[PDB]
Design a protein around this ligand. Structure first.
Ligand code: HEM
Ligand code: HEM
Ligand SMILES: CNCc1cc(F)cc(-c2cc(C)cc(N)n2)c1
Ligand SMILES: CNCc1cc(F)cc(-c2cc(C)cc(N)n2)c1
Ligand SMILES: C[C@H](O)[C@H](O)[C@H]1CNc2nc(N)[nH]c(=O)c2N1
Ligand SMILES: C[C@H](O)[C@H](O)[C@H]1CNc2nc(N)[nH]c(=O)c2N1
Ligand SMILES: [Zn+2]
Lengths: 414, 418
């Protein structure tokens, strides 16, 4: 079977055969579509792990034109011995790099995947303690940041064993700003991080209580209680936000960090689960300008910005929110570009994703993609992805969601 | 039970209405086709003249639903209606809806349109019964009355006009226009396009049918009307029935000189209305615009009027790189001008902020009274400023309820001319 997708702007039609390889569930049924559900849908047994390992080893050896080779067949037998004797197995370095790259290649919600094959993989599977995790993360940050010339990277900590010895980064990203609920109901800093800020304070973090405090790392090794570490400030690259035309913009006192580094997801490769695998790229401007700064539940600066623009805020039909939103996103891109910190605007990024998708259809037989996430949160239909039909399905290796660790961790101290 | 969450407010709604869905979405548990424009060809009865065991179950389903809707399931009138429909199919291979059943079915097809953000208005629909029509001249008369009623001097009113249902498939009524009012599009000798490029092919059919094109940028197309399967016929809508808004800007005096206008009445006329297994192939329906439809899609799509370059030029923006967001900046001003213009001339229009807020309220009402509301996030979220509208942050379930509006083939792909 084949499935066709069409671009209604260009009338290009692409043919998807890759979906036949898909694995788990989308959440949809034959009679209900759950395409807009954010999160739809203890550890594996010996019998569950065998076919998962085989499928991955088979696809790795197919990718390197050695399917059926002597090395293919011996690797399969070796993997089987490990599962039989130890109930799990260990990836070779080559397979770990391949697995990490393809989890990114398969991330249907990521618009930046044209870069998937240029990913720096830091093998941190020898780590045993939170102090070790801190060291590996500092090196990751320093390498990825590269003085503003940002480089994609992932650091992979020991895989899950019995489920009782998980490695976890408790932060949702390596670098985020704290949030503080005030007695009067207002919020200082990032409202999204109020709860995680509370957890850090309880663990002994002494907060400066400002609007852009870089949070400490909260690191869990081997299922032990997590521990606090301050990222050395010289490794946190930040950009003060100014506007090329409104000289008053800098008086907003806005800044942001340069490195987007997701640290709460789970990396699954051949049935193995890497519960701590922080990865980073570089920003698309709308992540900051639209979501971080203008979500009502976030820094929520639209009112303040429109006021300084003297816009008429009496009625919605004046589109004052729309006008202010554009200017804010102009300033974000101008600021990063001026400080020579890597950033991509939504027009350039969506254009590259369409080229990526077409190449993937030609060379791989498809490209799973989540339209709801791929279309930027402003100016949707003037980007080419809006007009692009997409098919969403789950391939493995994959990045997955997992519960927040504080909802499952059982504490040990006193 | 299935839950949807709003990530702005943390409201969670519980859906049980999906348990009444009838047609495939196109998705499976392994593949989601939520961004496919036409994902599924699952129809409720085969192409034309169904057998009795094919049509009667669909009719029984709808009459059952309608009589349930009015607290009369199993009543005398319900069981007589079942026997009546049973005899009509036995003797004519079809059946006829009562006027009340037609109105019920039309309102619920709108209520069930998962792609429509304007559905909070669904029960305020004026239904014009045109099932007595026999010729294209009569169709033109019915359509003129619809346009005049729905326009109402700028105070627009939602309406639908329903022509005779399909019988054997050779006697279809069709409006060949995709909307009652659209602008012509012309292929220029050099290679570009004048007017609306989306209507180049339809404009050619009209010209090839004897239409004398004024060959301008905003030439209201004629109506091409097909009655009882005969060849379609051209009619010019009296221009005094076609309300148009000239587009100007509340700040930019030069904006009026772009010479843009649009029409006030959006009237979809190429869709199919399906009620109880009956297929009404000509059912033009109209409401009032959301501003983004004109200012974002009609004006700023690359393959439509494509005016961003022009507007940005006049705005003196840096169009050297995409990162200056010169496209986004011009885009806002254009949509400001559209709202200001319609509102200045007292022609009904809604912005995307008010429309999306209304829809959230509609969703809440439907979950409260009906146990669900089918909605297509891909279509509901406006094509600009997505996440500063509340629908962007609203999870939605999509499923297909009947009665419904469906797509159908363009009639020039199927019509055997005489
Ligand atoms: C190199 C530049 C990159 C760009 C410009 C980019 C862009 C984006 C954007 C805009 C999102 C949406 C984020 C949100 O709205 O929360 C996203 C999501 C995502 N990205 Fe990328 N990305 C990049 C690199 C990477 C890398 C290196 C990886 C992993 C190795 C990755 C994996 C993902 C995943 C898994 C998601 C889904 C996140 C979720 O479900 O919450 N991306 N990306
Ligand atoms: C009264 C004000 C109304 C508003 C503001 C409104 C708004 C909209 C918008 C913005 C769309 C997307 C259109 C597009 O992108 O092409 C749409 C689609 C749709 N509307 Fe509504 N609408 C209204 C009335 C109605 C009425 C009266 C009906 C039927 C009786 C209806 C049925 C539909 C259907 C079936 C679609 C889907 C069209 C398709 O799939 O191509 N709407 N509406
Ligand atoms: C909740 N969604 C996860 C998330 C949150 C976030 F703030 C940023 C990113 C992200 C990640 C990468 C690798 C590049 C990029 N441009 N953005 C992802
Ligand atoms: C194939 N696209 C369907 C379409 C095209 C179009 F131009 C306009 C509308 C529409 C219809 C109604 C009743 C209200 C409204 N505001 N818009 C729908
Ligand atoms: C409800 C909806 O699924 C949710 O708000 C999604 C919409 N699309 C998104 N797209 C991106 N890139 N990031 C997001 O967080 C979301 N949120
Ligand atoms: C590919 C994609 O599904 C297609 O471009 C859709 C997206 N959402 C839309 N939404 C609306 N309201 N109208 C449209 O025409 C479209 N087009
Ligand atoms: Zn789906």
């Amino acid at each position: 079977r084949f499935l066709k997708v069409k671009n209604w702007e260009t009338e290009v039609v692409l043919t998807d055969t890759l979906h036949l390889k898909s694995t788990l569930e989308t959440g949809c049924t034959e009679y209900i579509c759950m395409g807009s559900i954010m999160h739809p849908s203890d550890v594996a047994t010996k019998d569950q792990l065998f076919p998962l390992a085989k499928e991955f080893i088979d696809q790795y050896y197919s990718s390197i034109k050695r399917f059926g080779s002597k090395a293919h067949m011996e690797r399969l037998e070796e993997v089987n011995k490990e599962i039989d004797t130890t109930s799990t197995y260990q990836l070779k370095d080559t397979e770990l790099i391949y697995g990490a790259k393809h989890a990114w290649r398969n991330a249907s919600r990521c618009v930046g995947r044209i870069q998937w094959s240029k990913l720096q993989v830091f093998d941190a599977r020898d780590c045993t303690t939170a102090h070790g995790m801190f060291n590996y993360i500092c090196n990751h940050v320093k390498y990825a940041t590269n003085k503003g010339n940002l480089r994609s990277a992932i650091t992979i900590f020991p895989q899950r064993t019995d489920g009782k010895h998980d490695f976890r980064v408790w932060n949702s990203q390596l670098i985020r700003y704290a949030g503080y609920k005030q007695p009067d109901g207002s919020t200082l800093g990032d409202p999204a991080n109020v709860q995680f800020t509370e957890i850090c304070i309880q663990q002994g973090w002494k907060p400066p209580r400002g609007r852009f405090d870089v949070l400490p790392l909260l690191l869990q090794a081997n299922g032990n209680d997590p521990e606090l570490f301050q990222i050395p400030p010289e490794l946190v690259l930040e950009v003060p936000i100014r506007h090329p035309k409104f000289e008053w913009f800098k008086d907003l006192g806005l800044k942001w960090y340069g490195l987007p580094a997701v640290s709460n997801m789970l990396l699954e490769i051949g049935g193995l689960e890497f519960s701590a695998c922080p990865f980073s790229g570089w920003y698309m401007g709308t992540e900051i300008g639209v979501r971080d700064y203008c979500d009502n539940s976030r820094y929520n600066i639209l009112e303040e910005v429109a006021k300084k623009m003297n816009l008429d805020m009496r009625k919605t039909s004046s589109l004052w929110k729309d006008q202010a939103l554009v200017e804010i996103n102009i300033a974000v891109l101008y600021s990063f570009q001026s400080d020579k910190v890597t950033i991509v605007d939504h027009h350039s990024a969506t254009e590259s994703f369409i080229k990526h998708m077409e190449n993937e259809y030609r060379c791989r037989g498809g490209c799973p993609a989540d339209w709801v996430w791929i279309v930027p949160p402003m100016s949707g239909s003037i980007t080419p992805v809006f007009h692009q039909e997409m098919l969403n399905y789950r391939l493995t290796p994959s990045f997955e969601y997992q519960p927040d660790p504080w909802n499952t961790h059982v504490w040990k101290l006193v």
